[PDB]
Chain A
C-alpha cells in the first residue's frame, strides 16, 4: 500500500479548497 511519488512539474489545477 505505497503512495507513488509526485514526480512531474505539471502545474496543479485542482478544484478550489472547501470550507468546513
Chain B
C-alpha cells in the first residue's frame, strides 16, 4: 500500500491529510504524495488560498520496476524529467501566474456571491459602462471566474478562466499574462458582438 519516494517534499498522506498539513502554510506551498490510481501515478497538492487546494496528477513513464519513480513524468500533458523540474517549471510558474492574477486591479477578493454583489453594485453607479472582474472559483480549484455586464440593464454573464503553468486559458487560447487576457476577452466579445449584428439574409 504505502509507497516510498526519496524526495524532500514527499509525504505519506492521503488527499485530506495533505490539505490539513497545508492549511497553516502559505500560498504556493505543496506536498508530493502517492496517488489512489496505482503505482504509476503521484499527486502534487498545493495551496492557492485559505481552504483552497488543487491536486495535480503526475503520470509516471519509464519505470525501472513497479515501485520505482518513473524516469519520465507527465503533468498536464507535458513531459518532465524529475520532481524538481516539475516544481520549478510547472508549479512555480503556476504560483507566479496566480499571484499576477490576484495582484491585478481587475481581480476582486471574496466569494462568488460577494463579487456578484460588487459587480451588480458597480454596474449600478456606472450604468453606461461595460464592467468585468475576475475572482477565485472556490468550487473548482485552479479556476477564476470572469464576470461581466454590458450595461446597468444587461444580465450578468459568468465565464471561466483556467490557470495553467503558461498562462490563463479562456475559451480556446492560453493568454500569457493578465493584461493579454483582458485584451483578448475584450477582443473576443467585440468579435461575438459584431457577428450577432450581422445580416445572414444578405
Contacts and interface: CB of A to CB of B under 8 A. Distances in A.
Contact of B130 (A2, A13, A17): A13
A2 B162 CA distance: 12
A12 B150 contact: yes
B179 interface: yes
Chain B interface category by residue count? 20 to 34
Interface string B177-202: 10110110011011011001100000
Interface stretch (B21-29, B30-38, B151-159): B151-159
Contact of B193 (A12, A17, A19): A12
A6 B186 contact: no
**SS class of chain A's interface: helix, strand, loop or mixed?**
loop
B132 interface: yes
Contacts of B159: 3-4
**SS class of chain B's interface: helix, strand, loop or mixed?**
mixed
A20 B179 contact: yes
Interface residues of A, number: 19
B150 A18 contact: no
Contact of B160 (A1, A9, A13, A14): A1
Contacts of A7: 196
Contacts of B130: 12-15
B129 interface: yes
Interface of B: 128-130, 132, 140, 143, 150-151, 154, 157-160, 171, 177, 179-180, 182-183, 186-187, 189-190, 192-193, 196-197
Q: Which 7 A-B pairs have the closest CB atoms?
A: A10-B150, A14-B130, A6-B192, A13-B130, A1-B160, A3-B159, A17-B183
Given A11-B150, A15-B129, 16 more contacts: A1-B143, A3-B160, A4-B157, A4-B158, A4-B159, A6-B193, A8-B150, A11-B193, A12-B150, A12-B186, A12-B190, A13-B128, A14-B189, A17-B182, A17-B187, A20-B180
